[PDB]
Design a protein around this ligand. Structure first.
Ligand SMILES: [Zn+2]
Length: 253
DNA sequence: CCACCG
DNA sequence: CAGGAGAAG
């Protein structure tokens, strides 16, 4: 689950419980139990996302930080319901009609307002690809900036200090869209390619967010052994940056 | 380069 | 049941 999927989840958490008084609050972790009574009768004011970090803001200036990594997932249920699952329950935020449940995530903590800028992940993250205020022109500047112009794309497009919310499927899909392998740096692109990359870094995540739940589809991710829809070569699966990697040898260079 | 499910 | 599927030491 990458930025698009986390923002879709956050939207569903807001539809379920934004603004509604909490009738019960439960945390599995011993260090979070102290906040249960403190949050009963408060409400979620909004669910913010910064890339894959999810920030559940409450009406008393606390914010729950959660990060699902590769395995966490939120579920929305009617209050009192809890469908059988083998997953470990980590957070329950309950209101009169709907409850939200966080399963499996291990990175969960309660933040005071000052920590929204000093928490180690929140301090390092770059601009979010789903932020409508972030433009292709600003992404082009970021690519060409001294800080990032010499970085290889293979790792750059996984690094949340560059653009928050990109993960491996988005890396693979963006590089195929612009015809590039991961072994390039922004300093070496021509202006047309840089512009194409800047646009794709925003437009593919935004299209996935809008339509994965003309609709988003994978062009190469998990399509090894299939013909590329652009040039017909057979898509390959390898590893890149210690993660799987999908690409087309006929049209990515 | 710690942390559910062929 | 070792190893595959976001991020930091
Ligand atoms: Zn191709």
């Amino acid at each position: 689950p990458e930025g698009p999927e986390i923002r879709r989840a956050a939207d569903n958490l807001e539809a379920a419980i934004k603004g509604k008084p909490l009738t019960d609050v439960w945390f599995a972790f011993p260090q979070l139990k102290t906040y249960q009574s403190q949050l009963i009768g408060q409400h979620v004011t909004h669910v913010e996302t910064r890339g894959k970090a999810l920030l559940t803001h409450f009406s008393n200036d606390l914010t729950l930080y959660s990060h699902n990594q590769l395995y966490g997932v939120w579920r929305v249920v009617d209050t009192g319901e809890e469908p059988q699952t083998t997953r470990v329950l980590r957070v329950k935020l309950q209101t009169a009609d709907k409850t939200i449940l966080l399963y499996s995530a291990s990175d969960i903590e309660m933040l005071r307002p000052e920590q929204l800028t000093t928490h180690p992940f929140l301090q390092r993250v770059g601009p979010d690809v789903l932020d409508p205020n972030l433009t292709p022109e600003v992404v082009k500047e970021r690519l060409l900036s001294p800080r990032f112009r010499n970085r290889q794309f293979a790792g750059l497009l996984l690094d949340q200090a560059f653009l928050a919310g990109l993960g491996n499927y988005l890396r693979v899909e963006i590089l195929w869209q612009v015809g590039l392998t991961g072994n390039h740096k922004a300093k070496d692109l021509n202006a047309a390619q840089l512009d194409a990359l800047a646009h794709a870094l925003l437009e593919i995540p935004r299209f996935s967010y809008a339509t994965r739940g003309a609709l988003f589809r994978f062009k190469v991710f998990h399509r090894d052994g299939e013909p590329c829809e652009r040039c017909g070569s057979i898509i390959e699966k390898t590893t890149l940056s210690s993660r799987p990697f999908y690409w087309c040898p006929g049209c990515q260079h």
